[PDB]
Design a binder for this molecule. Structure first.
Ligand SMILES: COCCCNC(=O)c1cc(S(N)(=O)=O)cnc1Sc1ccccc1
Ligand SMILES: [Zn+2]
Length: 247
C-alpha cells in the first residue's frame, strides 16, 4: 500500500484493501456549526504526559513514529474507560493549506499529529487523539528534540533516540484542549479497521514553518531516497450515517 504521491514515481488509497472501502472510514471534514454540543463530553485527564523521557523515534516508511510503550495514558474526554498510549506519529505536507488528515469547515492544516491509544483490558477499542498543526513565527522549542532527531532517521527501518522531552512539550497548553470534536471512525492506513473513537482538538499546535518543512526536507519514503516523505495523507472519506459532536 502507498500514498497517491508515492505512485507518482503500489496500492494507492482509492485502491486500498482490507476494510478501507467500508462505510465508517476516516478522516473526514468537520462542519463545525453542524457538530452539536454534547454535555457528556468533559475535559481529558492526561497521565504520564508531563514526564521527561528519552523517546525512540523511527521512520517506518509511512511516517515518523515514537514508541510510547504504555508510559502515558488518558481518561475523561467522554471516554468509557482509560486508554494506554502506544505510539505518536504525524501526517504532513509542505504547504500551509495541505497536510492534515481531517479538515475543519473545509480548511486543512500543515500537519496532523495522532497519538494512538488502546482500551485498557468493537467500535472504540482504539482512541486516537488528533492535533492540527499550523505555522507560527516562533520556533516551538518543545518540538525541537523531535525535529532534531529527524536527520538521524532519513530512510525507512531507521531509528534514533531523542533528547529528553515530554508529550506535553509537543502539545498546546492543557487549558486550551477543552474544546474538541468527537466521532466514530477508522484507522487512516490499511487495514483501516473501523475501531477508533476519534478526537480532534480545535486548538492547533504552532510550529515554525521551517520546523514543519524539516519533515519533508529530511525524510524519505524509500531506502534509495528518491521520494521525499510528504503528503502521507489519506483522502477525505464521507461522514455517511454518522454524526459529529463537540464538547
Ligand atoms: C502512519 O504510519 C502508518 C503505519 C501504520 N499505521 C499506523 O501505525 C496507525 C495509524 C493510525 S491513525 N493514522 O492514527 O489512524 C492508528 N494506528 C496505527 S497502528 C496501531 C493500531 C492499533 C494500536 C496501536 C497502533
Ligand atoms: Zn495517523
Amino acid at each position: 500500500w502507498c500514498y497517491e504521491v508515492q505512485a507518482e514515481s503500489c496500492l494507492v488509497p482509492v485502491k486500498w484493501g482490507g476494510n478501507c472501502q467500508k462505510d465508517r472510514q476516516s478522516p473526514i471534514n468537520i462542519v463545525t456549526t453542524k457538530a452539536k454540543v454534547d454535555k457528556k463530553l468533559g475535559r481529558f485527564f492526561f497521565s504520564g504526559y508531563d514526564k521527561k523521557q528519552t523517546w525512540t523515534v523511527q521512520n517506518n516508511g509511512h511516517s515518523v513514529m515514537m514508541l510510547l510503550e504504555n508510559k502515558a495514558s488518558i481518561s475523561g474526554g467522554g471516554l468509557p474507560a482509560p486508554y494506554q498510549a502506544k505510539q505518536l506519529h504525524l501526517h504532513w505536507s509542505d504547504l500551509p493549506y495541505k497536510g492534515s488528515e481531517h479538515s475543519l469547515d473545509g480548511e486543512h492544516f500543515a500537519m496532523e499529529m495522532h497519538i494512538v491509544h488502546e482500551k485498557e483490558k468493537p467500535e472504540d477499542e482504539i482512541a486516537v487523539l488528533a492535533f492540527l498543526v499550523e505555522a507560527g513565527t516562533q520556533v516551538n522549542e518543545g518540538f525541537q528534540p523531535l525535529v532534531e532527531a529527524l536527520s538521524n532517521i532519513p530512510k525507512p527501518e531507521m531509528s534514533t533516540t531523542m533528547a529528553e522531552s515530554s508529550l506535553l512539550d509537543l502539545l498546546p497548553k492543557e487549558e486550551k484542549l477543552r474544546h474538541y470534536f468527537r466521532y466514530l471512525g477508522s484507522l487512516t492506513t490499511p487495514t483501516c479497521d473501523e475501531k477508533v473513537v476519534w478526537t480532534v482538538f480545535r486548538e492547533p499546535i504552532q510550529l515554525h514553518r521551517e520546523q514543519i518543512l524539516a519533515f519533508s526536507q529530511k525524510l524519505y519514503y524509500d531506502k534509495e531516497q528518491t521520494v521525499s516523505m510528504k503528503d502521507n495523507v489519506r483522502p477525505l472519506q464521507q461522514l455517511g450515517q454518522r454524526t459529529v459532536i463537540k464538547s
